[PDB]
Symmetry: C3
Subunit: 346 residues, 3 copies
Amino acid sequence: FYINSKYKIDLDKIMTKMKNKSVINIDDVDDEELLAILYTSKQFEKILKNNEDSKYLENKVFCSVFLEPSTRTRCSFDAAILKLGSKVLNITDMNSTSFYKGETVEDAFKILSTYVDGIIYRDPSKKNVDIAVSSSSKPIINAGNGTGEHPTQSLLDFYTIHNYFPFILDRNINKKLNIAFVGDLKNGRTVHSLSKLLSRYNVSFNFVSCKSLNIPKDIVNTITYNLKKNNFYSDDSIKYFDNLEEGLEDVHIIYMTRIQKERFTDVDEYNQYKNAFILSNKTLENTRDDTKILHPLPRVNEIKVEVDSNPKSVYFTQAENGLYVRMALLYLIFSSTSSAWSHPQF
Amino acid sequence: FYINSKYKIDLDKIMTKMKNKSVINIDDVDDEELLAILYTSKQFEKILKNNEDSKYLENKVFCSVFLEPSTRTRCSFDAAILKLGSKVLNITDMNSTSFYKGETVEDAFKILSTYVDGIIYRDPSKKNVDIAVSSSSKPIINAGNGTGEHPTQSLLDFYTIHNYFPFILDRNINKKLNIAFVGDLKNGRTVHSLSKLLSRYNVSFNFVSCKSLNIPKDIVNTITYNLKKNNFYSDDSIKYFDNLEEGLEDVHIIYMTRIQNAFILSNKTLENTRDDTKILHPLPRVNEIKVEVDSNPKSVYFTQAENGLYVRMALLYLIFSSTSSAWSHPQF
Amino acid sequence: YINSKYKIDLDKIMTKMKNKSVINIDDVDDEELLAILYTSKQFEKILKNNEDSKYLENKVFCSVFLEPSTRTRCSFDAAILKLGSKVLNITDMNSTSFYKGETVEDAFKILSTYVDGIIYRDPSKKNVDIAVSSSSKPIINAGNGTGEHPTQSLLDFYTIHNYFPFILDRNINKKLNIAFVGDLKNGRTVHSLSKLLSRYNVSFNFVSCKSLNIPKDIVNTITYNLKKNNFYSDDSIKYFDNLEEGLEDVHIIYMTNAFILSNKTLENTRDDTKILHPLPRVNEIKVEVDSNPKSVYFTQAENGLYVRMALLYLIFSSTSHPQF
Ligand SMILES: NOCc1ccccc1
Ligand SMILES: NOCc1ccccc1
Ligand code: NA
């Protein structure tokens, strides 16, 4: 098993290590584990695109508990479980208070973990996902919470980037990836998580935003500390812009965020913050030829429909890659054992 | 090898043609495809009634999107997928506005169609099912929308009729089927769709309604056009009544509708019907059919609803199968 | 097929339970109870040893839950899926929004044509029985307003039998004493389990504040069942208003302020006593008790998986049985 032909993956070793691991935070995934996730994700991508048998994890029964609507993420996880050949029981159309009708989170997860092999949990509360992990006799995969931990989104973001720029994994002082993060960097927690993961590599960051909505100082400190630890930190590691023409120059990746109207004082202030960072074929003319455009979605008015036709757009491939990354992570964690012959390989 | 009474079906040829077909409208189903659906539905009926293995389509993962409550239709489709041996993820509980949350229907179906083999979609909006079809990389089956397109309801209605009156398939000038449609023919879109399908055959229509709720003119025009194509149109092809006594006389089929006093069916109103007449109702019923009729052997509305399982299994099998053998098809 | 000493003709008992609806614990007789306990135990050992649990694939069920009861519904879903079968779910509705004008008889006549069996939870008394009349397929009652909840009684009994397997012997010398604590008027889980336990050599302490005592007709049923097997005495049924007296010399404490259980209130219980609670709990049992080896309420909830798998297996199987 090789990825990029450079890095050998002992999937047998790495699975023994990941068996029954809970994944709450992207920091719960180390270098070896990231390689295993990326290799295994790529096998599921090729197997599914070639219409082959995807049933690499068959006899498992999961519970998916989504205590806020997040239909795209929930469907992606359901699809991953079912495509692997396993089964799932769903709790949706509930919130925290109506699901825990008086009962403690500890009691609920202690009991529910006796019924199933694994739990997928989405809850806007941060307190609750951690209480669930303490109480559960079974592995939990966080599908998103209030603190902005959403490891599967970070992992699929990274998988998408590595497919176009596989050199991010090399940690080569000569092969540096430049990414612009555009829009609401205060509230776009998907930026916070992916920045933490990218800062483990030779990466330079453009933060493109307007005053009130800049990247928070704690994320810059984390980026800085991770770049210093691998000797990739310089005066040029982190640049700040308030406009696209400067921000989008000489970047391999443009990652747009959701700009929600609820985040401004009125609709005036919101329509002037869209319009400024709205992406068009015009704003993309003086980007690199190899630039790829990501967006965690849903896209509303941040990227004009005309860009969908532009070969630099990959936000829909990004969403799709979520299926392959969620299948990979479930396979590595919930497999009973491994043997050589049993792993996915196309 | 594949015969429907005495018409031979090249299920292999017909499936090559239906593979990854979307089915939005009963007009998306042609003669050969209708035969394949009827043959295949009948196999699933016999297989399930004899408790044999029904798993003719394993390895598929579907998404079912119901953006209005239609629990009977949703459960029917779920049951069909699961009985075929495939798996499904469900989006229910919701309406158009709460599901799209101001994301476009095109983006939502572009993404969702990357996750699954096929989508079952019910939405009161007519715009939405068509946008979904243009955006989806995967086949869509319309389970009902606002324009009254509901192809699986037409198909199961037709399957039910063909089981009692298999001569409707012959297009023989001497073997004419007479159907009375009773109740709200203006708003009963199930009548509109089935009329379109029935008018492809040697069929005569009684439209039994009050003035305000008659069959609409464009449906009469479509019936007339379809009857003329096969030279089955006459001055006697389409009669209009406002009362059951006259309406229900010499009709092989009585198809009742929800009338949301005059058009209530009872064992009394059934005395001057043919011996062989069968009674359909798309369901749910309120007062249109008195509970006493359930005991009358002419009632088949519950067998009708049951046949929905076998027709939805057939249609999923014919569209989503990725076999390459005649030997692999259902053949009990 | 033995439970250490009773031989089970699982073949004969399944021929009898095939396509049986289970509404009320009285729908389960002695032989059927043995089959459910034997089969439950096989699924317990199979799952704890991570072996293949797929003893019933090829079935498709419908689960209809017309009140929120996420614990019970998930337990049933888990049981169906672990067995290898499939389920279609109708939830997050109530009786009025699900029927929307349509009769219960029409809805179950139709829905029973789609599936091999139905799991039905409805706070209505009348509806589960109408569903049973109308359905062409077996119904398992997952709980209704009349307080019928057979699977809870069965898993309660399974839990007790695991610690005190002598309840099955009907030996005049091997008597089980159970204290029922809290709201015995409204705690219908007490009503059902009392009816089942009274079929055996069992003595009952009813621990309650006056306003919430065990109802007279349940004491009459207990008395009738004890008399039929010649286990009735002046000591068969005691009443207390306090834990000190109630919890003395009882093998089982079943919970549902004076009646808050703590490590303190458990000091002068027998060494072998086990503590049940159908759950969810609020204050009735302090978190400190969870550490006390007498607590089994979480093992109890767990056993619901194995009992619901057993019951579905014995009813829906078309017979190779689970063993070891
Ligand atoms: N209103 O829903 C009634 C129903 C649901 C499912 C199947 C049959 C009937
Ligand atoms: N309050 O939710 C408690 C619960 C426990 C186990 C399974 C589902 C729900
Ligand atoms: Na499901």
